[PDB]
From a paper:
Other streptococcal-secreted PPIases, such as [name] [name] (SmuPrsA), are required for cell wall and membrane integrity and virulence in an infective endocarditis model. Additionally, the secretion of mutacin, the major factor in the colonization and establishment of [name] dental biofilms, is dependent on SmuPrsA. As key streptococcal virulence factors are dependent on [name] for activity, we began characterizing streptococcal [name] by determining the X-ray crystal structures of [name] from S. pneumoniae and [name]. The SpnPrsA and SmuPrsA structures were solved to a resolution of 2.55 Å and 3.15 Å, respectively. As expected, SpnPrsA and SmuPrsA align well with an r.m.s.d. of 2.36 Å across 264 Cα atoms that share 49% sequence identity. Consistent with [name] homologs, both streptococcal [name] proteins have a central parvulin PPIase domain (SpnPrsA residues 143–241) linked to a foldase domain (N- and C-terminal regions). Furthermore, the streptococcal [name] protomers are linked by a domain swap; protomers A and D each donate a segment of α1 and the β1, β2, and β7 strands to the domain swap. The interprotomer, three-stranded β-sheets formed by β1, β2, and β7 strands are presumed to interact with the cell membrane. Previous work of L. monocytogenes [name] homologs has shown that dimerization is critical for [name] function. This is consistent with our dimeric SmuPrsA structure, as is the dimer of dimers observed in the SpnPrsA structure.
Here, we solved the protein structures of two secreted parvulin and two secreted cyclophilin-like peptidyl-prolyl isomerase (PPIase) ATP-independent chaperones found in gram-positive streptococcal species. Two types of ATP-independent extracellular PPIases exist in pathogenic streptococci: the parvulin and cyclophilin families. Unlike cytoplasmic PPIases, extracellular PPIases have canonical secretion signal peptides that allow for their translocation across the cell membrane via the Sec pathway. These chaperones are lipidated to the outer leaflet of the membrane and function in the space between the bacterial membrane and cell wall.
Numbering used by the authors:
A (entry chain A): 28 to 294
B (entry chain B): 29 to 294
Write the structure that this text describes.
Amino acid sequence: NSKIATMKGDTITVADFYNEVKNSTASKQAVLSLLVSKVFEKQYGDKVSDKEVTKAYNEAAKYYGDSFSSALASRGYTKEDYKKQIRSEKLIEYAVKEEAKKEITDASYKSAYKDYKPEVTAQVIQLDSEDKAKSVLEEAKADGADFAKIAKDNTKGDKTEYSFDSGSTNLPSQVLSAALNLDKDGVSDVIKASDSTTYKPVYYIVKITKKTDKNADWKAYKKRLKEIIVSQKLNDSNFRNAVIGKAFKKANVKIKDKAFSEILSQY
Amino acid sequence: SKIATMKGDTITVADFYNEVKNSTASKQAVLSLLVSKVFEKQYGDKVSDKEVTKAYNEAAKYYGDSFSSALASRGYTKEDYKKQIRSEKLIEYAVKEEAKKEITDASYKSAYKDYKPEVTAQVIQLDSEDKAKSVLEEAKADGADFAKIAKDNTKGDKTEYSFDSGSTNLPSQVLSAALNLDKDGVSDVIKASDSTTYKPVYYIVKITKKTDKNADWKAYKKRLKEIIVSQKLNDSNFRNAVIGKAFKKANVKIKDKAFSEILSQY
Ligand SMILES: [Cl-]
Ligand SMILES: [Cl-]
Ligand SMILES: [Cl-]
Ligand SMILES: [Cl-]
Ligand SMILES: [Cl-]
Ligand SMILES: [Cl-]
């Protein structure tokens, strides 16, 4: 198309260049990125505001602090490519969440009520040492239980008052799940759980404070249950590849150059 | 000129170029092409595509059948590899030729200065430093014993080696230290290392036949002429210079600012 470098005789052109990086595994990620952008920018471009993109960018900075500038250059990213990738993950997210709320049927709300426990409120005791978890346990199982005290005088940190459903993100699955099975004013056992980043086995002790009735009507919890089916679909690759496989067809996307033929081998 | 199409929008090669031009991988692509074309019109007839095929076959036999997967693990193709062997040979020939031009008499003076006559010794290669001591002391009985205890002890294939101060037969340690002995005599346990593994190898050199310096140039020229080349040949700083010159002759100049300082190192 254009010229890149000149020399006596032959010269480098945008074509000669493309003919080299054309089959580059890194080029496939580029073409596929332009498709996702142009497609979702026309079908959802107005949905996600450039104001939301900023909020996410500013938070991304506040976290890495004065390391953000470095952290980016590290994994090969300019401060414009990052703020540009935050928008795409937010477009595909908006699309993945509206279509996840369309397919919802009756059988789904009924297959989501089976394995669902009502919201609970307990006194959690997080610990790093397992022998200390076995210690606070017998103190909790004494004549003067006084669990709340044992908690506030031993917890690894954070708080002691925790509220959670069955499919809610608040405590490790191990804890979250074993905790619900307990009944009104029921003390747990030493629960071993991995950490989100340090993988340092954290040991928890939970005691149910206030709990409610399981209930039997599905329409009763359509609020929680509905946002839970979306929460799962939104976290499912096969479903995300699918909503992309849809938008791409709705945009009648069709590759011309063979090199990138296997790009939509998952859409 | 277009890559993919859609409803009311199109992805042309222009959009793509404006996406990966500032990429680090793309900077290498421009350079590789710029390097090839220049060394092709200036030294293409010097490197025969028949000489590249032999160099390629050597790589194959070495990696054996795993050559296919090996290239895949490095991201190379089975043509891009052979393609790289050519540019790796064009530049190599330019360095040898270019380095064999500004050769001055003073260059031969600084070469004969620290040079030493070619010597032949009955070397011994060992794994553990422990036996490296055992073989030495048992070699200190009558003297001529070292001969037989050098055949059934050396971990290497041959014992007789022919080297000077510019060869790369034995390690630099076991090389220079082996040129500090007399016409005859053994040496101390030289602690060296392997190229493939880091395993420390312990050598024991024994001079058998030596020559002597002739305090002259041509007395040792074809050797002091190859050493200067092999030195500028392995000097990255000088290698950059030849590229800087080839590019200077082809009057090379970039037009897109997206690849401005790609020759700042050249
Ligand atoms: Cl829609
Ligand atoms: Cl609190
Ligand atoms: Cl249960
Ligand atoms: Cl002089
Ligand atoms: Cl004998
Ligand atoms: Cl031999």
